[PDB]
Design a protein around this ligand. Structure first.
Ligand code: ATP
Ligand code: ATP
Ligand code: 9E0
Ligand code: 9E0
Ligand code: K
Ligand code: K
Ligand code: K
Ligand code: K
Ligand code: K
Ligand code: K
Ligand code: MG
Ligand code: MG
Lengths: 326, 326
């Protein structure tokens, strides 16, 4: 049985983009693999988080992991900062990666561009992510398309460690879904939907109510051609909405194109809103159950004990390979 | 009673420069303050260390700390990597410091210049050093002159944390000795003596034997004026040797100038070598005692337990201020 690791930042409430690109597949993969799923709060603070909001986003993400169907007896669910080994291995991998490699990362370039001063944590985001992955001898990392480059750097860091010091790490491999690997923003269809977007109209969160979802879909930007057909270059907004519709309803894109012949954007968007609402309905109900209870903390307690045992042993091996300590 | 923290890298065997600028003063300060003295092996690997050499340099530095008179009942002696809180607080402070501040650090600029690829750990050396200091509510940091800028950044990071999140850190202050704060290299008197110099002639280590010390002092570069007098700009080599002589023998510089009127560089250097040798003689004897015994490990074991208790509590407060975890 191979091992899976994946994380999500408590930098906000997860979006349908996070759901379609990652979390939805976690729920199937837990039955086929040894799975670790992580709330990566040390990654979240690489940009400013208000402390009260961050504490609460951590609880909410834990509740949403379990609400969408992750079974804490089939997968290990835990908070990054409660496992000190992650920071320990991240320091060691920071001494392996070169500065030039971190500066050419697309996400660092995008998230720092135009900013006068950004934190060192933003630059050193990959070594901590590589630590999360590599500590558990991970084979498969399910992520959306935007993380492919980070996984490629992780493979490089693991090879480098293994060849500079001796074979220790499994070389992980990304698993990127064929559909929905990059949901686009509702207000700018040339950039991806991000849960930290300063514009709330850009994303649907899993906790948005019905009136909010209706507003956000009906104001999603589209062209003026008036024809519901998939075409990424010429109709990027409608294409994105057809992708969300298709993957949540199970109807193919061409089935939806046929379903909306001679139909206007207005009835298409009204319908899509109800597809998303009906999708989120059972999720939000299990979410409220987990938020109201102390069972949520026991799951995370148990998860951190299990993760600590595995990770702190791999840290011992890393230190012995590098010659640290005794 | 105020608190002292200082560290030394196991990147090599400590030099008379490390002794004169720092370690020698640790031995007096342990009786006046609550003292933490650290073997900072996570800092050492920011550049390449051979694992076997690093393991052994860690033991040797512990032995030399105790050999020069640090009492493990008056000071806490421990290895950085055995206290996970250091890496944990270093990550948090990496999210506080800005990249621009790390790039303007003199040591980073000096240690990376001319190198094609350096590690991210070299750049993020200060946040880990600021973590070491700040975790113990340190008041005073005894260091040589070359660390003044790092302490200034540490004060900035502490103020920033305190004002962004609430008062938590003591603002530390450097204590730089008036004499011997910057021993110069024996082969290039315009740069400081460094224990990682690729040229062993540049430094005297505390473990150098008599014939080695004699060779290194007699080949120390000097001018050709032939006059033993202190003048930093025109006679930087002889000035440095007069500084080492003065501070190890207790004779003032002008006393030594009078002592060597009409004397040549050859008798001056021969004499200085024996001053250094006689200085190192009792140190090397206590060093060999500590290396041959398991008592060295018990000291470090006890030190790490004491440091962990203090540091892991400050990490809890840091996490609660930033909103990490629960
Ligand atoms: N538009 C998106 N479409 C599909 N998957 C996504 C999308 N955005 C993020 N992901 C995936 O969701 C997972 C979690 O990523 P993350 O926690 O960074 O969400 P995010 O929306 O990008 O938040 P942030 O803006 O703070 O980075 C990753 O595997 C990531 O590739
Ligand atoms: N020439 C020097 N003169 C006086 N003090 C020094 C000198 N070099 C280092 N120090 C002091 O010794 C202490 C320990 O520093 P460190 O462990 O980095 O030694 P180092 O010789 O600089 O080794 P490296 O070359 O690996 O950096 C610091 O307080 C530092 O300021
Ligand atoms: C959530 C972030 C990260 C934390 N450590 C891991 C481990 C696996 C996948 C990811 C991550 S995905 C990445 C991202 O920025 O998308
Ligand atoms: C030894 C290094 C470092 C590790 N953490 C600390 C704490 C205090 C003083 C120093 C240090 S001095 C610094 C240096 O590079 O000189
Ligand atoms: K946020
Ligand atoms: K919002
Ligand atoms: K599109
Ligand atoms: K070395
Ligand atoms: K040497
Ligand atoms: K000089
Ligand atoms: Mg992201
Ligand atoms: Mg140094």
């Amino acid at each position: 049985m191979k091992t899976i690791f994946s994380g999500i930042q408590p930098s906000g409430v997860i979006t349908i983009g996070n759901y379609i690109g990652a979390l939805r597949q976690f729920v199937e993969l837990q039955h086929e693999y040894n799975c670790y799923f992580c709330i990566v709060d040390q990654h979240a603070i690489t940009v400013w988080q208000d402390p009260h909001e961050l504490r609460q986003n951590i609880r909410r993400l834990a509740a949403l992991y379990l609400a969408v169907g992750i079974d804490p007896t089939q997968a290990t669910l835990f908070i990054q900062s409660e496992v000190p080994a992650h920071a320990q291995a991240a320091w060691m991998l920071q001494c392996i990666v070169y500065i030039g490699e971190l500066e050419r990362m697309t996400q660092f370039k995008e998230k720092s561009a135009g900013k006068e001063a950004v934190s060192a944590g933003l630059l050193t985001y990959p070594p901590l992510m590589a630590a999360d992955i590599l500590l558990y001898n991970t084979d498969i990392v399910p992520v959306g398309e935007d993380q492919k480059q980070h996984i490629e750097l992780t493979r490089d860091l693991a090879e480098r460690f293994n060849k500079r010091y001796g074979e220790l790490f499994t070389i992980p491999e990304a698993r990127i879904p064929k559909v929905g690997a990059r949901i686009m923003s509702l207000v700018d269809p040339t950039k991806k939907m991000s849960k930290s977007d300063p514009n709330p109209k850009a994303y649907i969160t899993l906790l948005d109510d019905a009136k909010t979802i209706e507003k956000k879909i009906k104001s999603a930007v589209t062209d003026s051609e008036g024809t519901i057909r998939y075409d990424k270059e010429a109709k990027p907004g409608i294409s994105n909405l057809l992708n969300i519709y298709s993957t949540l309803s199970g109807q193919s894109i061409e089935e939806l194109e046929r379903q909306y012949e001679g139909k206007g954007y207005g009835v298409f968007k009204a319908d899509l809103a109800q597809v998303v609402i009906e999708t989120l309905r059972p999720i939000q109900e299990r979410y409220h159950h987990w938020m109201e209870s102390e069972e949520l903390d026991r799951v995370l307690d148990e998860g951190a004990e299990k993760a600590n045992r595995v990770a702190s042993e791999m840290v011992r091996k890393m230190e012995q390979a590098m010659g640290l300590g005794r």
